[PDB]
Amino acid sequence: DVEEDVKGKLDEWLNALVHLDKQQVERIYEELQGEMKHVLDFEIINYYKLLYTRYLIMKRDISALEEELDKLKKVYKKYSPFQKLLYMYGRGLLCCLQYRWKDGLDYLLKTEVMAKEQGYHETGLYYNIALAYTHLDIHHLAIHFVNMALEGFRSEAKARNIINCQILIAVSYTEKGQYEEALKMYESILREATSFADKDVLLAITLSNMGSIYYKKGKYQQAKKYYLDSLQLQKQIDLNYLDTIYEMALVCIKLEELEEARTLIDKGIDAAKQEERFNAKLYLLLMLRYKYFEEAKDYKAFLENEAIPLYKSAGNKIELKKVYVELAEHFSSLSRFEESNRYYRLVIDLMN
Amino acid sequence: DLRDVEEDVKGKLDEWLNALVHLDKQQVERIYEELQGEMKHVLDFEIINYYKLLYTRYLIMKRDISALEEELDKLKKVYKKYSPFQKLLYMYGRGLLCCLQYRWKDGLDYLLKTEVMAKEQGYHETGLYYNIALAYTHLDIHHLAIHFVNMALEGFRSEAKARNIINCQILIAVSYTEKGQYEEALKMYESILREATSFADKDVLLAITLSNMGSIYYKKGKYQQAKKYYLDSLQLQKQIDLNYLDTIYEMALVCIKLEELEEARTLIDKGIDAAKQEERFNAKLYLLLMLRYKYFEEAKDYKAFLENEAIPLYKSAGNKIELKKVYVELAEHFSSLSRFEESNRYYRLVIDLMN
């Protein structure tokens, strides 16, 4: 009977896990570990076990999540409709963390239809669904859920999530649509003045995209300022950082600033050798240096003997296509259209 | 009085809806002719337009594209002020319109918005999921195609509609075929060979399966098997339609690989005359005509037909899939005539269509 407070304590831990109050999550997680050893009601135990999976995604532990999620898998039959709900939710987030967006979406969609049946709501769910749809390129459905997520997030007055939705919205309308509508969304982010944790991380991304938008619009001077501001906001060395440098180095070329361009390129290269995680990005910067600061004779040489054989290792995306097009454009520029056709045909075979 | 006249019409309109959703052709035609004698009595703006949107679905079922536009272009400006369900009917009809016109990318765009409106109104249609996946198939986006058939599949399962369930299985095996997994697709088609016998239209199910199987044996290299599966498919094709033109076009290619040109030459002429009759087959008519010129007409005449008739036709209608095919043939042609610069030109054009 005394474990009915733990039942309520498990519900309190649920609130801290939904609104992501990490300071409250940790104190309850510790308090429970001592009290969870005594209680032996499996509708109360499996409650904690599933909330732990929710705790694991907050602690970004994929491996431990996979372990536990596979354990609860067999016990799924005898769960409560709400406990059944949490399992489907956890696997969705797992696949999202494993970037299996199609598999995650299936789980997250079931997570929605269960929540509706038993009359349960969580604003984070809509966001994840929207993030799922977005990362696998379904625009209309992504926008649908990200609005409902945004509506709920405004009612909860959490500015961090507000921007996250606004970023997604602006990104989607940028992928296929007018930039003037996407720029105002980014502009709305900058005007926003509620200071929170890692707001500067979001602004770094916001500025990075605006730099890209204005780069496509031809407005190079403005784009460079946005790239510059982004870089100085960036505190990491992640993939998003190497992108902005590569993009900014392009702007310097457009603005007849080959010195600043090469400097940025060299820094990108030096920062890319650091890890094998972005080994692909490394050669993108090399190609850029051969293209503008080396002989075209050597640029072709690097593309044929270094670039192409590198992307034998899962360069299947734009990277390998990029190398083929550049070579194709190279020969057709020298009016040597035969070799140009050869590489052009390879581009078609790749985009099968 | 006039008031109860409409009350019964609304009921009869809702009945016409379910017949148009569950595809009851004999029931659709029945209510359709009945409504025409009743719809001239009702004058309610809400009810009249409700009928007009439903009438579009009739035109889709009757596959009357030329009349399908006129009804939609008549509503393209004012539909925004209708009831929210009338919008969904408009977006849906417009979506399938693009599909019937082989503008799948545009069709998908409308269908996806239709699904968004579906969730907004608390009303979904399992048939919609299928069409979305069908559009996703022609766009070669198979991972999303598979995503939507599974929703349609489980939808069709709960609705106990075993016939449409098979349609999903066929579509699944199609994506697997394009995904390179030929063996798992064949074994999937064999399972349909047993399932087919349970339905009335079994002969049209076999013709499709035997066709798609023959296509797999064609991609493997087993051409002698390819013809046998195609021949059995054609022998069941007693109805001249889209599927007929697919089988007879694909078989012609098989007779080319088997160096049986005379039979291939015969098949094309039969397929050409078939497509000339109904103008819904213009896409495949000029596709069949390209085969006629590629092998049995001189190269210059083949080139002339591509530049002056093929491209203009596939440019008028946004049938980019076929326009891609024409560009490659022109690119490969000039490449043989050592006119690489003009060949190179078309290679740049075909890449733009893939982005």
Residue numbers in the entry:
A (entry chain B): 67 to 418
B (entry chain A): 64 to 418
The authors write:
Previously, we showed that this process is regulated by the sensor NprR, which, in the presence of its cognate signaling peptide NprX, adopts a tetrameric conformation allowing its binding to specific DNA sequences and transcription of genes involved in survival of the bacteria in insect cadavers. Interestingly, NprR contains both the HTH DNA-binding domain and the two Rap-like additional TPR motifs, and was thus proposed as an evolutionary intermediate in the RNPP family.
We thus used the truncated NprR(ΔHTH) form of the protein, deleted of the HTH domains, which are known to be highly flexible in the absence of DNA. Because crystallisation trials are performed at very high protein concentration favouring the tetrameric form of NprR, we also used the (Y223A/F225A) mutant that has been shown to impair tetramer formation. Crystals were finally obtained with the truncated double mutant protein NprR(ΔHTH)(Y223A/F225A). They diffracted up to 3.25Å resolution in space group P 21 21 21 with 2 molecules per asymmetric unit. The two subunits (called apoA and apoB) display the right-handed superhelix conformation characteristic of TPR domains. In particular, the dimerization interface involving the C-terminal residues N407 and Y410, which was observed in the NprR/NprX complex, is conserved in the apo dimer. Comparison of the two subunits of the apo NprR dimer demonstrated that, due to distinct crystal packing constraints, the pitch of the superhelix formed by the 9 TPR motifs of the protein is larger in apoB than in apoA. This discrepancy, characterized by a Z-score of 7.9 and an rmsd distance of 1.99Å over 293 aligned Cα atoms, reflects the elasticity of the superhelix and suggests that, in solution and in the absence of NprX, the protein dynamically oscillates between distinct conformations.
